[PDB]
Structure 1
Amino acid sequence: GSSGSSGPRCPVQTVGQWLESIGLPQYENHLMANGFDNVQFMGSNVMEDQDLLEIGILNSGHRQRILQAIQLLPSGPSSG
């Protein structure tokens, strides 16, 4: 293979469907309540193990589960 470019063109997912994947839909209003309507932003320097505890989610077993999901999300530059 070996493909070096900057045009993946993939289907953008949303926080809602995203949570449904990990298996924690209960946290659908949580993030949305903490002004977290950005899926692309997640995975860099926001929504960490600590941020998950501040938003309200205290469940450790779930906190970590989310950390991984966010780490898998697409990461990139944010300039507007």
Structure 2
Amino acid sequence: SKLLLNGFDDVHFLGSNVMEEQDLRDIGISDPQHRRKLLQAAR
């Protein structure tokens, strides 16, 4: 039997996870203050 679904399942979940992990860290890399800290560093 193919039994491909049994394997893809673990993947179907990883997706939402990879987003939840990047969505929680993005808030810190997209913060407003970042502009003030990037301006003095880029200047």
TM-score by length of 1: 0.21
Larger radius of gyration: 2
Greater RCO, CA 8 A, separation 6+: 1
